[PDB]
Amino acid sequence: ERIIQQTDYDALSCKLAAISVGYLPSSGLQRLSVDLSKKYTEWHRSYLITLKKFSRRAFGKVDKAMRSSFPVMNYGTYLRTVGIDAAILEFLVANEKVQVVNLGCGSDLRMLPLLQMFPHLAYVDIDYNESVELKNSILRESEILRISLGLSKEDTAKSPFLIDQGRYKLAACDLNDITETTRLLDVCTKREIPTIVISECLLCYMHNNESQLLINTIMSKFSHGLWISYDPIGGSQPNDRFGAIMQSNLKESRNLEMPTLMTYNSKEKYASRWSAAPNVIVNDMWEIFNAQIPESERKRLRSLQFLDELEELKVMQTHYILMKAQWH
Numbered sequence: 651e652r653i654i655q656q657t658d659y660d661a662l663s664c665k666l667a668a669i670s671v672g673y674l675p676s677s678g679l680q681r682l683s684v685d686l687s688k689k690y691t692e693w694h695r696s697y698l699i700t701l702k703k704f705s706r707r708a709f710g711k712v713d714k715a716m717r718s719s720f721p722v723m724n725y726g727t728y729l730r731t732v733g734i735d736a737a738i739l740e741f742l743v744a745n746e747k748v749q750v751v752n753l754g755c756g757s758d759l760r761m762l763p764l765l766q767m768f769p770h771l772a773y774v775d776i777d778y779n780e781s782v783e784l785k786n787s788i789l790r791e792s793e794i795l796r797i798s799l800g801l802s803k804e805d806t807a808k809s810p811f812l813i814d815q816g817r818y819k820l821a822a823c824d825l826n827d828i829t830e831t832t833r834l835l836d837v838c839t840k841r842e843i844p845t846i847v848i849s850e851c852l853l854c855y856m857h858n859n860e861s862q863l864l865i866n867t868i869m870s871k872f873s874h875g876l877w878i879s880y881d882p883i884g885g886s887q888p889n890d891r892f893g894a895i896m897q898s899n900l901k902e903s904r905n906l907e908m909p910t911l912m913t914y915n916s917k918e919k920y921a922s923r924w925s926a927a928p929n930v931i932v933n934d935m936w937e938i939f940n941a942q943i944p945e946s947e948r949k950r951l952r953s954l955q956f957l958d959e960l961e962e963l964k965v966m967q968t969h970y971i972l973m974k975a976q977w978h
């Protein structure tokens with residue numbers, strides 16, 4: 651599905667806006683060095699310019715959305731990114747030899763600093779064929795991105811990978827197809843290695859059968875895991891139109907669906923999908939803003955742009971959640 655694939659352009663636009671303004675990198679929360687903080691910005695800037703070489707249409711969409719980004723949206727992107735990263739980093743620090751599987755990775759570049767930071771990390775990026783082909787093109791065309799992953803300019807990887815370069819793999823898969831998915835995982839991961847699974851704005855685009863089988867199958871496949879999921883929720887308090895409005899706005903405007911947004915309309919309902927894991931934690935992103943962001947960071951962000959409407963930020967961010975499920 652082209653339309654589902656193109657939701658990544660929004661995610662990338664948001665990432666680039668946050669970096670351009672300076673919300674990210676957050677060197678404390680993302681545990682970046684002086685050099686990697688610089689590279690973080692450089693890598694993303696290069697991605698954008700390289701995207702332009704490969705697609706006028708995609709660049710246009712990203713470019714226009716990124717320059718029109720509002721502060722409330724930038725705070726969202728910041729919270730989403732440092733929330734996920736904080737969870738990843740705690741686990742990688744504790745477990746030196748680990749494998750990360752990023753499900754529906756789109757244009758995500760968090761592997762670039764992570765692979766440098768953690769010598770025994772192995773990382774697998776998975777998305778639809780058309781999406782990974784574009785990412786592969788970009789990563790190999792840009793000199794600084796090539797250097798960051800040790801890539802040849804040429805496509806030297808053999809099916810089933812587009813990149814198969816040591817501790818990093820990029821592979822096409824339709825994650826609605828569990829047989830394809832398990833066959834892929836069988837040749838790029840091992841059962842016994844501690845595993846982080848990432849689903850950042852992936853599961854919201856799936857029907858419940860597909861998302862549940864994906865969760866159940868992948869938790870069954872690895873002995874020792876942490877699943878970090880980020881997604882919107884419809885909202886549970888009465889007279890909360892957020893979910894209804896979002897679904898209507900997405901169908902009307904873009905012919906896009908979020909099939910379980912109203913089903914899993916609270917953080918509790920959402921987290922229940924991982925109830926086979928013994929250790930499940932869920933917070934909305936306002937809770938993250940108030941309890942996990944240090945005061946030093948709130949002050950920094952206040953220096954970048956005016957957030958004139960803090961309540962509006964709250965109303966939005968209570969509709970995004972970060973779920974951490976751990977099993978062994």
Ligand SMILES: C[S@@+](CC[C@H](N)C(=O)[O-])C[C@H]1O[C@@H](n2cnc3c(N)ncnc32)[C@H](O)[C@@H]1O
Nearest residue numbers: 655657658661754755756778824825826850851
């Ligand atoms: C909103 S984007 C998020 C991308 C990235 N995780 C991020 O947060 O920046 C959703 C991504 O999930 C991918 N996706 C959705 N359904 C998929 C499926 N059935 N198989 C593989 N990828 C899928 C899309 O192609 C897209 O790149």
